[model samples]
Target: GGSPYLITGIPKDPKHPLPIRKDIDDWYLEQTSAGSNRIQLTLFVEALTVIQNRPLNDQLSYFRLAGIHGAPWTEWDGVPGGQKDSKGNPTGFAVHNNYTFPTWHRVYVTLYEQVIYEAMLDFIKQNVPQNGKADWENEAKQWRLPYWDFARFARDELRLPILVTMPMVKVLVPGQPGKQLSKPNPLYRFQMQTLMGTLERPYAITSQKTEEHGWSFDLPFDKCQSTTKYGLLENYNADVWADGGQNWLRANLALNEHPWYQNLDGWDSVPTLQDMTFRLLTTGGLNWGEFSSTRYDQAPKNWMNLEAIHNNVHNWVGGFMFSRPGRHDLKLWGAGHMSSVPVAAYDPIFWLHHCNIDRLTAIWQTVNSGSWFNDDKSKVSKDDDLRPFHRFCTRKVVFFRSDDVKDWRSLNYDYAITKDASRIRKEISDLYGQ
Candidate 1:
């Protein structure tokens, strides 16, 4: 089978030659630039309009199916598979193996653009009134209308349908696969294709223990051994720092010849990769998959695997906590914080993580309401500081900068909430029985 359209532009070299960080920065700049951003926003609104006018169940079915394709092989998909080398041991991608965090994420962003663009174009042609108007001008005019605001206004004023219904149309209408819908288990077929395509070629690298310098592997939560508390919330501390900035990376490099790096499973026994991967995979925003891998079975029974998985899902799907500063920066960067670098672009997971992060942020706003608009500078800083910083094109770039991301009011273009605060809170309450 062939790779999905979204996973293009990836370098075949094990060591990715593309400057992922710089590429991402350029992409961001381009997207936010006046001309592109306006056009994109209009397309986004048109996409939302199509979704809004669709049947709720139909939309849900489509999005759930789309999720299978985009997020295939994740902890969410309930599939047990890992990237293995020719020897069947976990090895990172050769070039990307060194910077798995950034490479996969870049791929995620690329896929997002592809998916969104296709969906928006389809929606506009089908629903919008574009009778012989210039494509660019029409799109620009359509964007000017507060379509998203109108949806929110209607949802709020008439109370016709709840926000959870947003994804029903928003996600599915954009990429409804007709062929998959013809199958016995349409959702299953969709999932299979998604998984198969996602696993195809370089994207399907094994996730298992491998040689120190090897390129692919998957670490189960039970296997990871490292632990530390970093980040503003002091919530994350796991994995090895491969990039050359933070102290953790320095330590890992200095100890490369140690037993942990030499032994196949020793990496799992340490507090670095073992504990963190387990925590993030099992508890964080991406806790999406089932216990299909032996590595998962090896996880300690006492560990809050479910929590970790939920947190992973929440973080990946809902919020954005990129690589932090100092040694903590090593932790996030070790996880592939390409945003740390200004022009590097390697993997697809980067954008997916951000999308989910954006999604989670929307969810958080819906739940907390005023919390989203609250400009509490003390709680959140607007500093534009970059790490391991260097000049690109003779202009210095800072990593942590704020650009007035006020709320989901406009950001929820063509995306909607499936589970609001009441549902989320209830789920959490029931899970904890609090």
Candidate 2:
């Protein structure tokens, strides 16, 4: 009835060192650097265009990929079995509020990286000039997804990059050194190219029984676009710090303007997102169960779980809603794509956010060496199958278990922390230490 928790994927090798997943800011600076041969940033923008160009019915479409996380709940990858709610409706394949949180999301982000990477390769083959096609192809191969270190960003500037927010961005024209052109930023919003249901009544079907849930947004958003509240509002402030700096002071004024924002207290004392990140990484001793989730009984002594720290970024980026519980309800206001579990993946920021989550998992695993699943206390086991995701081996589908993903190095990506642990620790303390 049980399989041994073992590494089932590609083992680590020096010949094929994992690609480094970098901070979005650092990634952009390097990719768009002077005289650089890299077209990865350009290809990333192009890849989004290519994927968004796909119709909703297509298996690889942006809509379908985003829907796998939640909303339009339906069976994906032809894998039919997963838990159904009390109402007999699909709960989607995402594993939340449990031990598999990190690994499950690891699989998701890896899938997204692969999908976009393939799209980049496709675009290069068709569009890039033959003169530099091989170089373009080579650069494309080097592309790994970049993470938005929101905590680091906030700690430094309290502002997000224009690349993440602006609808238009400049990318170097491949092979035309020092020449650049502006393109529609795919990070801005995924335009609804084709509706899933209809113009007047677009719905991600709840079940075969009825179409109970559809986006409640008004014009443009209702059927034409995916959105983040910050993207829509053009506000870069995440409101992590309640009141202090100019950004926080501005956010304080903005908070007062919105009468809908309730339970406003203790926000001043709430640590900045960077502070949360510092504590989570530096806190020395924690087992997998304690480090991984927000389970009430399993909450760590310092009350910092990776998932708890991860949740704050979601709220700050998407706009928090009152429905979710916590003492930190002061920040709750409006709900957006990144705020909700089911629909968060639909937003562009969701990928970047989740990438950082995966990065934290890597750091935690390295820092707390030998610490793993606390099987004695956890309801779930590392051997449990991570549903809907499977490895195709010799034309056979072997469903990936939680244990399989424990070794992320086998996934072909590594965070900056993996190369230099002290570098990140120094950076963290430098950013957050008073």
Candidate 3:
């Protein structure tokens, strides 16, 4: 509860008596960079390779931690259908479907970016072009992961870029002291290391009750997938996991167009920057969906809240099929829900998908003039409208207040798309006669 297992696993230093913390000045993205810059295809591949190649373990593994934050599966959480870790702690490092949804994810992705940064650095340390460490380190500092602006893509029919949805990319890696250094793309798809603790159940479910007994297979989450007729049928199988399958993702997006986000306030269109701002500033700075239960279970106004629409995006990208453990091997098919929080991050696109989510939050803050979250000075309530945001060591381990995830400056970062924060700052300063 204090922090996520992913962060806890990082070696803590006693001299400091606290884990590493930073108000990160993380980079934001625009125009896909054509594979250039921090948030472009180039660095994404570099970091993904570093993490994916490291021998995976249930505890210290990179991908596993990614899943823990939120994905197609759940771990380190006491989810409705989840089991506690061997340590007797509830799993899951995130709060969802509820108000904490936005703030929790803000912190969640930040942790991931940091972890990826660490992994990339680790990669630099091990292999280099014979004392070429200096050059590598310099390049690494400028290395920041980018987010996929799906909204931007949808707006144009679109280039959609080639960085994502492809199986591999070509790059010049450190080869024999001087031979040709060329290899397939590691960033294209985060290859699941062979046979760790991957358990597969069924790939289908109609409703909550049906999902309860959905286990259809029990094999390496990777191997079992090789079974015949496996996958979804929406033109693209629910989990069309052929490593590089943009065709499927493309089809999927077409189907969920409104995705869960409806037209702007009363307009007939996808969510615009203004509509999202309206959402963040809704009812005391919290949106409608934030008040809903985690189960969310088909509740009203699901479409209105950014959280719910985001959920639909998760569902769409992850696919329509989901599986749970049941009696025996052969599985049944339900509506594919591949991007369920528990297993979503397992997919390579998870990070990029979240990048867009983070970008929008940044944009909304711009549109809101910084009057985003609920006031911290007021008496807190049990509802999402009044709860304060939180974080781990990143804020230098502060106890409480002005807050969490509340201000980007506290994190030492701002969006690449800058705005006059002063106008917004004044709105805040002027309010309450400050």
Candidate 4:
């Protein structure tokens, strides 16, 4: 019953023969490869706007609710504290800088995709067109959220489609014609409105500023204490990205420029599939210590590089999005959300970036399964189900676990790259067969 990554077969819409839809299907790579969209992308964003525009208290504002999950926040109304630090601030939902790192997000991303799917379907209901709605409905049934593979694309794109940085996107809305119009992209900003908060560490010294020319060190998000409010993006008002946030050029510029990102240019430095498989299976699956079976929150090491690579992606986005080198705050430019757990999910690209992270975990699961031998390094086992996580609803906290998500199928989507990999293999086989 739970096998269909997503189930969308209402059969109310027209069955445009494969010949007709093939072109659009072929064009699916637009968003897959470049994060652009042909049909469903904008419609999906349209639905996201509908959700985003909802009253702050509305249940559909789940996307907005994602921000408070991780770090430096206070206790939520119903849920337990997010593991507090010595200073007494809730540390954050168990994401990043932890061992359950990969699976926690697997569940997180699926719920997000599920919410987006819910929004898309709701939008379709309001405009069940007079004539063409049926055909479109059929198409909607097949719609799945897309993933951006940073490693698959060019270095400059910095793991996202170019359209991501552009404020206005030309997209075809479901009912609109005349080549449509370009509007403020919902993906560009999560539109935090007035819910501004700080991002200080669980136990960092505050009341000081780092030497970044124009600013002094301060705990911008000290949660129960800090003051700097979430300002609207200079480029896009009513959004969270402040002055220098999500700077694609800065993100790209630092990739080769900094050693933190791991140029790995030397011939022997590059890892093979087998190399990665070994590390992810042994070190990644095991805890950093015997006691912290769940908390792999140690500093990065070697080809255990997934976590290191993961850290680099964060620092890369966070640093380039504003600062350089380390992840302390930058005055006018604002610290990059991607770098820290406190406000990362508020960024739209955050989900896609995590999708890639989940992709690695998924791939590692497969590769490790065959070669993994028994090891009682910690209480957690390779097959142990991921612990439950919560989704704060308007009235209550909803809880689910990695066992619930394990893959995208139940959530109703699968990565295009997974499918693409199969297609490429098939093509290679066909060519060789000839």
Model number with the top TM-score: 2
- Tens digit of per-residue lDDT, candidate 3, span 254-365: 3334334332355445553334334433324443233322433434341244555466565555443445323532232223223444445555656666655665565555
For candidate 1, write residues 213-288 as lDDT tens digits. Answer: 2333222211122111111111243322111121222223322211121223423334322233233222322211
Q: After superposition, how far is residue 292 of candidate 4 from its true place, in Å?
A: 13
Best by lDDT: 2
Model 3 stretches astray by more than 4 angstroms: 1-43, 56-60, 70-91, 130-132, 158-161, 174-184, 191-230, 233-246, 252-256, 259-303, 321-338, 369-402, 419-434
Instruction: Give the per-residue lDDT digits (tens) of candidate 4, residues 133-157.
Output: 5655554665654554444324222
Please report the TM-score between candidate 2 and the true structure. Answer: 0.78
Off by over 4 Å in 4: 1-37, 71-83, 155-159, 198-216, 219-242, 256-258, 261-302, 320-334, 370-374, 381-399, 416-434
* Cα misplacement distance, residue 29 of candidate 3 (Å): 12
Query: How high is the lDDT of residue 100 in model 3?
Result: 50
**Poorly placed runs, candidate 1 (over 4 Å):** 1-115, 122-353, 362-403, 413-424, 430-434
Error of 4 at 98 (Å): 3.6
Per-model root-mean-square deviation over C-alphas = 20.3, 7.7, 9.9, 8.8
